[PDB]
Amino acid sequence: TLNGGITDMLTELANFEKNVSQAIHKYNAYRKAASVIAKYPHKIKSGAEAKKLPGVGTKIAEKIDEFLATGKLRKLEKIRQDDTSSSINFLTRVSGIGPSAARKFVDEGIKTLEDLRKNEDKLNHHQRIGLKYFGDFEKRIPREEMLQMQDIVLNEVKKVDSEYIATVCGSFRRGAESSGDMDVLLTHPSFTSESTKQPKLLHQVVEQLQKVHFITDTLSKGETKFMGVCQLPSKNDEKEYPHRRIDIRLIPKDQYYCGVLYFTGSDIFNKNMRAHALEKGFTINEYTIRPLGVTGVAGEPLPVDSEKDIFDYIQWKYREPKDRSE
DNA sequence: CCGACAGCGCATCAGC
DNA sequence: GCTGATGCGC
DNA sequence: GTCGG
Ligand SMILES: O=c1ccn([C@H]2C[C@H](O)[C@@H](COP(=O)(O)NP(=O)(O)OP(=O)(O)O)O2)c(=O)[nH]1
Ligand SMILES: [Mg+2]
Ligand code: NA
Ligand code: NA
Ligand code: NA
Incomplete structure (x- = not known):
């Protein structure tokens, strides 16, 4: 966190632009700059130096000079007072x-x-x-706790149908020592891009996790995505663990690689990678990677047999999950 | 100078 | 109800 | 707010 002061500032500006100004592009612009600066291996000495990084422009360079000289940003100081x-x-x-x-x-x-x-x-x-x-x-959720939650979810899913495959993605799969929540990618041979030979696949799992009292609340629930709350069980006399957010995403079995790429993130890594794909003439979502006709119409899905194949199409050297924390 | 900015599931809504 | 735009979050 | 055409 060589430039923690600068990145927090940009992040506070991004949140302002998103929540108050309701200017989503300025929000993403600030987040992008904060991200590229966060991985910069040197303690930034000026805005000029920062303006060399992709994503950091003239406006942000000036804010970085003000912040470095005074340790503050008047613009934020006023916002904090409104x-x-x-x-x-x-x-x-x-x-x-x-x-x-x-x-x-x-x-x-x-x-x-x-x-x-x-x-x-x-x-x-x-x-x-x-x-x-x-x-x-x-x-935050300590990785040790994420490991406990993983055991439960995987073991409960197995009890429902031994053919289910549950994979914990998000920051956990990226190796984070702590996560904001739990992300689970779920697959079952009965649900493919060609057909859904069995209904309630996601329902069955949620139902089973509620039965053992792992899932405690539901924020939203559909055929392929579940968003809710869960809690690890505590021992006798032991204080209760905090309630945690959990998302479960059921994806077509034959589209696991595209699905795990997406659910592993980060969100900015996906935005950067998808943007790059476009420049390379491809479009990527959680299901497939498709080419782009001159017109701008996604062609047919390209064959994918690993996360790496997705990287190869766009001419990107493979990056392990641990290196996708942008 | 200026168009575009990743892509999409679920909940909620208005219009027909 | 069906459909499409909107809010919100992953 | 930034960037590439
Ligand atoms: O805008 C988004 C948000 C999330 N995602 C993907 C990538 C991200 O890693 C994944 C899980 O979403 P979270 O909000 O849970 N982020 P992550 O798990 O990376 O971090 P955290 O530890 O905060 O949960 O969903 C996107 O593609 N776009
Ligand atoms: Mg997460
Ligand atoms: Na720059
Ligand atoms: Na999540
Ligand atoms: Na909120």
Whole structure:
């Protein structure tokens, strides 16, 4: 974290642009710059030096000079003092409450944790659960705990159908010492790109995880994606573990590699890699990698037999999961 | 100078 | 209900 | 806010 001060600043600006200004591209621009700077192996001495990195432009270079000279950014200092901005940024910290809903709650006078707690009947299901576990959801998950959760999920999925294959992706698969949540990619031979010879594949698994009391709440649930809450069990007299966010993504068995590439991230790594793919004349999603006709129409899916094959198509040297934490 | 910015699942909504 | 745009998050 | 055509 040679440039932790600078990256935090850019990150705070990104969150401002997303939650308050509602300018998603400025948000992504700041996140991109913070990312490229975070992996820069030198302690940045100036904005000029930073402007050499891809993603860092004139505006950010100037902010970096101000920050380096004073240790602060007036622009942020003022933002931190604006009541509306502060209210919106706080409210968006509740899962399910986005930029729009946050600004709307303010208009209605709901702008603090206490306000939210006395107005649950005004929150949709997702927001209600986000408020319920407001504190827990901001706690990190130690890898050791992720290892315990993995054992449970994999073992429970096996009990349902020995043919299910569950893989923990996200920051965990990238080797993180702590994760924000758990990401599980699920496959079953009955569900392929050609057919779904069996229904309730995702339902069965969720059902089984709820039965053993691993999954405690549901934020959203569909045929291929589940978003909810889980908790490791605690021993006698032992204090309870915090409730954790968990996402389960069922993907066509024959499209596992594209699926694991996507669910391993990071999100910025995916944005960078997908952007590169385009420049190389391909389009990548969690299911396939396809070429792009002159027109701009995705052609047919290209054969893929490993994560590496995806890298090869776009002429990128393979990068292990551990090196995708952008 | 200026168009584009990765790609998509689920919940919710308005219009018909 | 069906359909498509919108909000939100992964 | 940044970048490539
Ligand atoms: O905008 C997004 C968000 C997520 N993703 C993918 C990549 C990411 O690694 C994966 C899991 O989403 P999380 O939000 O859980 N991120 P990650 O697991 O990498 O980090 P964290 O430790 O915060 O959960 O989903 C995208 O492709 N685009
Ligand atoms: Mg995750
Ligand atoms: Na640059
Ligand atoms: Na939120
Ligand atoms: Na997740």
